[PDB]
Design a protein around this ligand. Structure first.
Ligand SMILES: O=C(O)CCCC[C@@H]1SC[C@@H]2NC(=O)N[C@@H]21
Length: 237
């Protein structure tokens, strides 16, 4: 997979999209730092030197996008496990979390955009970048956890290798789509929790998380069982 390695850019997602609009496919845009990194729904994503910031552009018909959406977080988890001894988990939708002192802090996130012919998967992982003092309460870096500077090159390389082997096992039919979902549920720290979810239509849904599937989250609320697509969830607390 072709990798365009930049020293800086506004956002790897936005730049990957311009290139994708013009025809490019199956490539990655990696940037040592971002001047305007973006998170889900209007969030800013601090992208100082030391972090891993890249966007993968894939053919929309390479495989089921809904399956890919679950595969990405899974691969990140399994790759980071090789570097961290602490508990890793997935917070709905795709926050990559690490347990610290009976507390979960965010190590990274995923921002995805899907079009008819391609999907852009933006991945941000806090590796050696310094987390702003204010949010050190909810965010953390791998360097803070391990006590050592990790190699961002190796991390990316292992992520890609892991992601591709899974891709080849799915198409080769060595593993079912459901097995990917089972891995997701295994790492999910959201299922079984009582939550208040803010949606993009201003509604707030409160309830017990029974399950998360390829389409979204399933909650037991006052109204009964409610299903919510992951793409419209602005905030989950
Ligand atoms: O947790 C989130 O809200 C999503 C964060 C996504 C961050 C990555 S960094 C690479 C890519 N470029 C961006 O501007 N955002 C994504």
């Amino acid at each position: 997979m072709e990798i365009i390695h930049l020293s800086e850019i506004d956002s790897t997602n936005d730049y990957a999209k311009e290139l994708a609009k013009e025809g490019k496919r199956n490539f990655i845009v990696l940037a040592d730092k971002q001047n305007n990194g973006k998170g889900r729904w209007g969030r800013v994503w601090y992208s100082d030197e030391g972090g891993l910031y890249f966007s993968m552009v894939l053919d929309s018909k390479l495989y089921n996008p809904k399956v890919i959406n679950l595969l990405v977080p899974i691969c990140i988890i399994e790759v980071l496990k090789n570097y961290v001894d602490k508990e890793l988990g997935l917070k709905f939708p795709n926050d990559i979390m690490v347990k610290v002192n009976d507390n979960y802090k965010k190590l990274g996130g995923i921002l995805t955009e899907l079009t008819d012919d391609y999907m852009i998967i933006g991945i941000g992982i806090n590796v050696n970048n310094q987390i702003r003092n204010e949010i050190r309460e909810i965010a953390i870096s791998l360097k803070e956890i391990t006590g050592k500077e990790l190699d961002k090159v190796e991390i990316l390389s292992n992520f890609l290798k892991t992601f591709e082997s899974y891709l080849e096992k799915l198409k080769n039919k060595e593993i079912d789509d459901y097995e990917i979902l089972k891995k997701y549920k295994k790492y999910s720290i959201t299922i079984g929790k009582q939550v208040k979810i803010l949606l993009s239509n201003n509604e707030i849904i409160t309830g017990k998380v029974y399950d998360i599937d390829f389409d979204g989250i399933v909650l037991g609320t006052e109204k009964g069982i409610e299903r919510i697509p992951s793409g419209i969830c602005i905030h989950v607390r």
